[PDB]
Structure formats: C-alpha cells, structure tokens
Motif scaffolding. Structure first.
Motif, PDB file in Angstrom:
ATOM      1  N   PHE A  34      96.506  20.142   9.948  1.00 51.46           N
ATOM      2  CA  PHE A  34      95.158  20.626   9.667  1.00 51.46           C
ATOM      3  C   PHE A  34      94.673  19.900   8.413  1.00 51.46           C
ATOM      4  CE2 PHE A  34      91.416  22.736   9.102  1.00 51.46           C
ATOM      5  CZ  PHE A  34      91.369  23.681   8.074  1.00 51.46           C
ATOM      6  N   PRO A  36      91.350  19.808   6.216  1.00 46.29           N
ATOM      7  CA  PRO A  36      90.038  20.348   5.843  1.00 46.29           C
ATOM      8  C   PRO A  36      88.997  19.293   5.476  1.00 46.29           C
ATOM      9  CG  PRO A  36      91.769  21.686   4.928  1.00 46.29           C
ATOM     10  CD  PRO A  36      92.409  20.400   5.380  1.00 46.29           C
ATOM     11  N   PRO A  77      81.276  11.156   5.043  1.00 44.33           N
ATOM     12  CA  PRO A  77      80.308  10.654   4.063  1.00 44.33           C
ATOM     13  C   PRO A  77      80.524   9.177   3.724  1.00 44.33           C
ATOM     14  CG  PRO A  77      80.988  12.839   3.473  1.00 44.33           C
ATOM     15  CD  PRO A  77      81.945  12.370   4.544  1.00 44.33           C
ATOM     16  N   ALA A 119      80.249  -2.215   8.213  1.00 41.95           N
ATOM     17  CA  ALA A 119      80.702  -3.198   7.230  1.00 41.95           C
ATOM     18  C   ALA A 119      81.033  -4.540   7.895  1.00 41.95           C
ATOM     19  CB  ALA A 119      81.923  -2.667   6.483  1.00 41.95           C
ATOM     20  N   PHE A 120      81.087  -4.550   9.225  1.00 43.06           N
ATOM     21  CA  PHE A 120      81.378  -5.771   9.971  1.00 43.06           C
ATOM     22  C   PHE A 120      80.198  -6.127  10.871  1.00 43.06           C
ATOM     23  CE2 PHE A 120      85.896  -6.084   8.962  1.00 43.06           C
ATOM     24  CZ  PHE A 120      86.239  -4.771   8.650  1.00 43.06           C
ATOM     25  N   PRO A 130      91.638  -2.363   9.267  1.00 41.77           N
ATOM     26  CA  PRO A 130      91.653  -0.897   9.184  1.00 41.77           C
ATOM     27  C   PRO A 130      90.270  -0.259   9.268  1.00 41.77           C
ATOM     28  CG  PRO A 130      91.975  -1.831   7.025  1.00 41.77           C
ATOM     29  CD  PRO A 130      92.116  -2.971   8.011  1.00 41.77           C
TER      30      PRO A 130
ATOM     31  N   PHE B  26      78.386   6.575  -2.953  1.00 48.18           N
ATOM     32  CA  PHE B  26      79.790   6.955  -3.067  1.00 48.18           C
ATOM     33  C   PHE B  26      80.606   6.042  -3.983  1.00 48.18           C
ATOM     34  CE2 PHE B  26      78.705   9.924   0.157  1.00 48.18           C
ATOM     35  CZ  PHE B  26      77.880   9.251   1.063  1.00 48.18           C
ATOM     36  N   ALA B  38      91.597  19.036  -0.782  1.00 51.74           N
ATOM     37  CA  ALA B  38      92.104  19.460   0.518  1.00 51.74           C
ATOM     38  C   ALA B  38      93.555  19.040   0.728  1.00 51.74           C
ATOM     39  CB  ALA B  38      91.235  18.882   1.622  1.00 51.74           C
ATOM     40  N   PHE B  39      94.448  20.018   0.858  1.00 51.74           N
ATOM     41  CA  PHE B  39      95.855  19.710   1.098  1.00 51.74           C
ATOM     42  C   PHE B  39      95.909  19.024   2.458  1.00 51.74           C
ATOM     43  CE2 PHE B  39     100.172  19.459   1.477  1.00 51.74           C
ATOM     44  CZ  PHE B  39     100.785  20.353   2.357  1.00 51.74           C
ATOM     45  N   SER B  40      96.440  17.808   2.484  1.00 48.22           N
ATOM     46  CA  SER B  40      96.535  17.035   3.717  1.00 48.22           C
ATOM     47  C   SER B  40      97.981  16.627   3.937  1.00 48.22           C
ATOM     48  CB  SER B  40      95.643  15.798   3.615  1.00 48.22           C
ATOM     49  OG  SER B  40      94.338  16.166   3.189  1.00 48.22           O
ATOM     50  N   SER B 122      94.654  -5.258   1.358  1.00 48.41           N
ATOM     51  CA  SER B 122      95.180  -4.952   2.685  1.00 48.41           C
ATOM     52  C   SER B 122      95.753  -6.222   3.316  1.00 48.41           C
ATOM     53  CB  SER B 122      94.065  -4.390   3.572  1.00 48.41           C
ATOM     54  OG  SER B 122      94.471  -4.313   4.927  1.00 48.41           O
ATOM     55  N   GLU B 130      86.920 -11.145   1.454  1.00 47.40           N
ATOM     56  CA  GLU B 130      86.761 -10.683   2.832  1.00 47.40           C
ATOM     57  C   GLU B 130      86.973  -9.171   2.882  1.00 47.40           C
ATOM     58  OE1 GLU B 130      90.081 -13.056   4.327  1.00 47.40           O
ATOM     59  OE2 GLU B 130      88.655 -14.360   5.363  1.00 47.40           O
ATOM     60  N   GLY B 133      83.903  -4.383   0.217  1.00 47.30           N
ATOM     61  CA  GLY B 133      82.961  -3.631   1.028  1.00 47.30           C
ATOM     62  C   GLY B 133      83.476  -3.166   2.375  1.00 47.30           C
ATOM     63  N   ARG B 134      84.648  -3.644   2.779  1.00 41.45           N
ATOM     64  CA  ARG B 134      85.220  -3.239   4.059  1.00 41.45           C
ATOM     65  C   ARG B 134      86.091  -2.004   3.851  1.00 41.45           C
ATOM     66  NH1 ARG B 134      84.925  -8.540   6.041  1.00 41.45           N
ATOM     67  NH2 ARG B 134      82.922  -8.676   7.153  1.00 41.45           N
ATOM     68  N   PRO B 135      86.053  -1.053   4.797  1.00 38.29           N
ATOM     69  CA  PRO B 135      86.855   0.169   4.666  1.00 38.29           C
ATOM     70  C   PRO B 135      88.361  -0.067   4.535  1.00 38.29           C
ATOM     71  CG  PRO B 135      86.159  -0.103   6.924  1.00 38.29           C
ATOM     72  CD  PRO B 135      85.377  -1.108   6.107  1.00 38.29           C
ATOM     73  N   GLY B 249      79.535  14.946  -1.588  1.00 39.11           N
ATOM     74  CA  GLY B 249      79.973  15.337  -0.257  1.00 39.11           C
ATOM     75  C   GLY B 249      81.389  14.929   0.102  1.00 39.11           C
ATOM     76  N   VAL B 251      85.323  14.712   0.065  1.00 33.02           N
ATOM     77  CA  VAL B 251      86.336  15.715  -0.214  1.00 33.02           C
ATOM     78  C   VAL B 251      87.618  14.998  -0.612  1.00 33.02           C
ATOM     79  CG1 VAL B 251      87.746  17.580   0.709  1.00 33.02           C
ATOM     80  CG2 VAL B 251      85.365  17.342   1.438  1.00 33.02           C
ATOM     81  N   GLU B 253      91.484  14.528  -1.134  1.00 28.85           N
ATOM     82  CA  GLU B 253      92.668  15.076  -0.487  1.00 28.85           C
ATOM     83  C   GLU B 253      93.840  15.096  -1.459  1.00 28.85           C
ATOM     84  OE1 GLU B 253      91.819  13.759   4.192  1.00 28.85           O
ATOM     85  OE2 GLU B 253      93.459  12.843   3.075  1.00 28.85           O
TER      86      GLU B 253
END
Ligand SMILES: *[C@@H]1O[C@H](CO)[C@@H](O[C@@H]2O[C@H](CO)[C@@H](O[C@@H]3O[C@H](CO[C@H]4O[C@H](CO)[C@@H](O)[C@H](O)[C@@H]4O)[C@@H](O)[C@H](O[C@H]4O[C@H](CO)[C@@H](O)[C@H](O)[C@@H]4O)[C@@H]3O)[C@H](O)[C@H]2NC(C)=O)[C@H](O)[C@H]1NC(C)=O
Ligand SMILES: *[C@@H]1O[C@H](CO)[C@@H](O[C@@H]2O[C@H](CO)[C@@H](O[C@@H]3O[C@H](CO[C@H]4O[C@H](CO)[C@@H](O)[C@H](O)[C@@H]4O)[C@@H](O)[C@H](O[C@H]4O[C@H](CO)[C@@H](O)[C@H](O)[C@@H]4O)[C@@H]3O)[C@H](O)[C@H]2NC(C)=O)[C@H](O)[C@H]1NC(C)=O
Ligand SMILES: CC(=O)Nc1nnc(S(N)(=O)=O)s1
Ligand SMILES: CC(=O)Nc1nnc(S(N)(=O)=O)s1
Ligand SMILES: [Zn+2]
Ligand SMILES: [Zn+2]
Lengths: 252, 257
Positions: A34, A36, A77, A119-120, A130, B26, B38-40, B122, B130, B133-135, B249, B251, B253
C-alpha cells in the motif's frame, strides 16, 4: 518478424526480451505494498469529437488504434504523459487472454493504452529509459450487458479482418473504454510485453475491470487473421517473475 | 542571452533568466515533515558498490565558486531498487556561516549545519545532458552534516585540502578515499521524492533520496568548511544553499514506518 508461440526466439529479436525485470506479471493483492503517495490518475482530452477519424489497424499481433495529440495523462504531480495508441490482448474460444493475471487468474482480455513522457519528443528516445513509457492496463471481463464503448471498435474488426489491413473510424470517447475508479490500481516497473521488450516501462493496472458481453468477447478473439492464414488469437505473453520487484497498490 | 552559464547565490541574475526550469512548480530542496511522509514498504535499502577507492589514482577537488566539488571516477554503482541503477559522477557540499546552518533540505523546519550531495547518472543515459529534465535521469543522495564532539576522519580528507583551493576556480588532486565513509550508517532509512537540481538549470525529474540518519563533524571542521573558501566576486563562499521550495502536492515517501 516476431510472433506468438514460435520462432524467432524473442531474445534473438531483442536482447531486452531476456531482461530480469519483464512484463507482464502475476499480481498478488495481499503482497502488494500500500503506497499512500499513489494519487488518482488524471486523464484529460480523452473525449474525442466525431471528427477527425482515427486509424484502426490489424498489424498481425493485435488491433491498434492510433490516438491523436492532446490526450494528456498524469501519474502524479509533474509527471505527465500523452497517449500514443491503444491495443488489445485476447485468447480464444474457451481460453482467457489477458497479459497480467491476479492471484493466478487470467481474464478474458486486456486493453493497453500506451503513453509517452512529455520529457521525450519521440518513442525511440524513451525506449529503455526509466518512466519514458507508461502503459495503462485494464482487464476485460464477461458480463450480461453489451458494452457500448467497445462496440465502436469490435464492430469495425470485420473491416480489417485480413492481416495488415486498416480503416478509419469515427472519433470516440477513449476514457469510456476504461474502469470506473481511477484511484484504485496497482503499479510497478517492467517492460514492453512484445519485442523489443525495452525495460523502464511504468505499468499501471486498474483494480476494477470493464465488462463486455460473451458475444463481444467472441468477436474480439475470432475475427482478425494473424500471420500464417490463421485466426489472430492468444496474442499474450506468459507472466514473468517479479524477481524482487514489489508491486504497489494505490489502496489499502 | 550572453554568459548564460553564469549564476550565483544571493543576487542577480534572476535564476529564471538563467534557466526557465528554475521557476518550475516542482523544485528542490523542500522541507520534510516526517509525520506527513508516506511509508512506502517498496523502498528497499540503497545499494552502493565500488565506493571504496584505492589511494591511486587521485581525484580532482575543485572550488567552482558555488561549492567544493569532488570528481568521482567510473565504477561507483548505486541502485535505488531492483533494475534501477546509477553511477556516481561527483559530490559536493552546501553549508552556512558563523552561527548559521546551511543545509538545503530541512526537517520539520529545522536546518542542519551542512549537507552533502552525491550526484548520480542513470545507466540508461550515456551523458548528463541527455538525462537533464528526464524522469529519473539523475538521482542525488543527500545526507545532513551535524555538529558532534569527535573529528570526522572521512571528511578530514576534504576539509584539510580546502586551503589549497581557497580562490574560486582553483583545483587540486587529492588521494583516493572511501567515498561511502562520508555517508550515514543505515542505508535502509531514508525519505524520497521527485524534484529538481537545486542550482541552475534546476532541471526537474531528479530523484532525491535523503538519509534519515546524519553524519557528525566537529565544530572545528564545520568552521573550516564555511570559513576557508571564497566565492564569486569578493565574497566568502558561505550560505551556498537554496531556499525551501513548496511541495505543491508532491508526497514525500519514507522507507520506514
Ligand atoms: C482488486 O483488489 C482486491 C483487494 O485487494 C482484490 O481482492 C482480494 O483478492 C485476494 C486474492 O484473490 C483475496 O484473497 C483471498 O482471500 C481468501 C479468504 O476467504 C475466506 O477464507 C479465510 C480463511 O482461509 C477467511 O479468513 C476469510 O474471512 C474468508 O472467509 C483466501 O481463501 C485466499 O487464499 C487461498 O487461496 C490462495 C490461492 O488462490 C492460496 O495461496 C492460499 O493459501 C489460500 O488457500 C486468498 O488469500 C481477497 O479476499 C480479496 N479481497 C477483497 C476485499 O475482495 C481483487 O482480486 C483485485 N481485482 C483486480 C481485478 O485487480
Ligand atoms: C528521522 O526520522 C524520525 C522518525 O520519523 C524523525 O523523528 C520524528 O521527528 C518529528 C518531527 O521533528 C517528531 O514529531 C514531533 O513529535 C512531537 C511529539 O512529542 C511530544 O508531544 C506530544 C504532544 O502533542 C505527545 O503526545 C508525545 O507523546 C510527546 O510527548 C510533537 O510535539 C511535534 O508537533 C508539534 O511541534 C512541531 C514543531 O516542531 C509543529 O510543527 C507541530 O504543529 C506541533 O505543534 C512533532 O509532531 C517525532 O516525534 C520524531 N519521532 C521520533 C521517533 O523521534 C527525525 O526527525 C528524522 N531525522 C532526519 C535527519 O531526517
Ligand atoms: C512503441 C510501442 O507502443 N510498442 C509497444 N510494444 N509493446 C507494447 S505493450 N504490449 O507492452 O503495450 S507497446
Ligand atoms: C550536472 C550536475 O550535477 N549539476 C548539478 N547542479 N545542481 C546539483 S544539486 N545541488 O542539486 O546536487 S547537481
Ligand atoms: Zn499490449
Ligand atoms: Zn547540491
């Protein structure tokens, strides 16, 4: 060219198909974590008008609907994507064909809506990166009532029965093909389920399903012709081991 | 515009002029409220291999005017989770001044004396440009440096070399060292969220991992860190941190209950 149930071996087509973290996987709800932080999915611009039309194609491994620009989606977000296309995976007479399974249970069929991170600029840039690609998956179950949203696609399959054929179809509400609750889903990182099987794909599987009539499910899995003068059926990949990955749940 | 690469703390040019991303919704750093994290349980212990470097070859330590940066060699592998690998590129620090804390992130409004950042790339990207800006293209490990009674041996290797590079633009080669010794003891307790670089270009999509446990430096060491280097123009290189940015907004973890 790759196919289901036969050569060439997928790892020969693409090394990534032998990666350690592949999709689809078997989801065990009790073992899902879970989280959140997983907020309700946001999908805007999915209610398309009658025109322009959209391309619907039988590519031999599925029926794929090409989606226009403007279908914006957010996994959270500042984590936005845009839909590129959607396609389906199904079985055959008396055999379920979803890709993902839940507690070992395979559903009749499954729909996939493929998205590209904003972003791509292009898919080739996102492959293997990723979160570059994000797929929304929903299970299609058998129900007593016929589904109006899916009727728009199923009634057009006969027009593209032969492999490689395509046709233009009227605009439709793409979001109507999805489950009712966008806040209940499982999420994990995996790969494309067909070559090149690139990893880094974020999979989001709705907890709620959508229902199609027995007749509609029959139409979906027994109309199109696949490679080798044979009905395109059982177009799904066997589940892959999580190998340590932990699936997250957006609900307790 | 001309000299787009130039920026500084505490004055023009406005960061948004240097890079539009510095005005994104952000950004980093942020204030961490443990109670609202948030405990994940999916967050597993961080894995860092190849960080114990031998005496040779030496590494470059440089005063770039914004911080003191240590260039890391190939081979430092890090994983945020199964199949989510990175390689370290460099590490640097953010600090305050006499009687003033200078960490970037804060916890429950509390600002710590200093903060160390280990920047990673990464493995899915061959070059930083490259990944920007990429996730998840870039991942930064952050740890707070607190005041303690004992001198920290690991940090002594860096602090004792600051006098050799007091002026902005100066650099020197230093002996290999155990990079992991600069980090906290527990790699299983941390906070994680997505944000941006804390300095221009402020590119978003950066995964931030902030250790829950801290490392200690003596008062003398913290003074050496904040009172030895000189920054842009004629000012002392101090208070080199960015103000807290709103979560808006997002959260945060936590890897622990
Ligand atoms: C959407 O998300 C929901 C919520 O998580 C999923 O629903 C849960 O699904 C799981 C897995 O299918 C269900 O777990 C099963 O619970 C059974 C409990 O039923 C009775 O038996 C026990 C006594 O043993 C009583 O304590 C209890 O009160 C009930 O009276 C178990 O019997 C099941 O385990 C058995 O079978 C499995 C193999 O099938 C074996 O591994 C076990 O050893 C054991 O023999 C199992 O644990 C859970 O009940 C569901 N929860 C709810 C609220 O419905 C949906 O599946 C998911 N749907 C989609 C499409 O994603
Ligand atoms: C590593 O991770 C740990 C674990 O989460 C962090 O430690 C926690 O830090 C938080 C925030 O600093 C602590 O939360 C605070 O708890 C106080 C409770 O203490 C007494 O008071 C209440 C009365 O309400 C009693 O019920 C209770 O039994 C105690 O006797 C609260 O008083 C705090 O809230 C108030 O103060 C803050 C200002 O500080 C205001 O913003 C609030 O609105 C409110 O007025 C607050 O909730 C928590 O106790 C810590 N837990 C533990 C186990 O130590 C570490 O900070 C973190 N470190 C790093 C470096 O990341
Ligand atoms: C670029 C593109 O969309 N290719 C795909 N290949 N397999 C996919 S699937 N079954 O994992 O959704 S998407
Ligand atoms: C390319 C590169 O590493 N640039 C950085 N800029 N700011 C960083 S920080 N303070 O957010 O770690 S890293
Ligand atoms: Zn698919
Ligand atoms: Zn930094």
């Amino acid at each position: 060219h790759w196919r289901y149930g036969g050569d060439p071996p997928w790892p020969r087509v693409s090394p990534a198909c032998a990666g350690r973290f592949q999709s689809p996987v078997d989801i065990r709800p009790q073992l899902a974590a879970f989280s959140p932080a997983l907020r309700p999915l946001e999908l805007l611009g999915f209610q398309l008008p009658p025109l322009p039309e959209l391309r619907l194609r039988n590519n031999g491994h599925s029926v794929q609907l090409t989606l226009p620009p403007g279908l914006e989606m957010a996994l959270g977000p500042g984590r936005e994507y845009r839909a590129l296309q959607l396609h389906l995976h199904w079985g055959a007479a008396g055999r379920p064909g979803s890709e993902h399974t839940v507690e070992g249970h395979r559903f009749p069929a499954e729909i996939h809506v493929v998205h590209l991170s904003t972003a791509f600029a292009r898919v080739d840039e996102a492959l293997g990166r990723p979160g570059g690609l994000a797929v929304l998956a929903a299970f299609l179950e058998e129900g007593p009532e016929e589904n109006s949203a899916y009727e728009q696609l199923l009634s057009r399959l006969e027009e593209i029965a032969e492999e490689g054929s395509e046709t233009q179809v009227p605009g439709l509400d793409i979001s109507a093909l999805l489950p009712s609750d966008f806040s209940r889903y499982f999420q994990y990182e995996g790969s494309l389920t067909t070559p090149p099987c690139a990893q880094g794909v974020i999979w989001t599987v709705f907890n709620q399903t959508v229902m199609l009539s027995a007749k509609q499910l029959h139409t979906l899995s027994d109309t199109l012709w696949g490679p080798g003068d044979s009905r395109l059926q059982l177009n799904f990949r066997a589940t892959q081991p999580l190998n340590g990955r932990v699936i997250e749940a957006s609900f307790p």
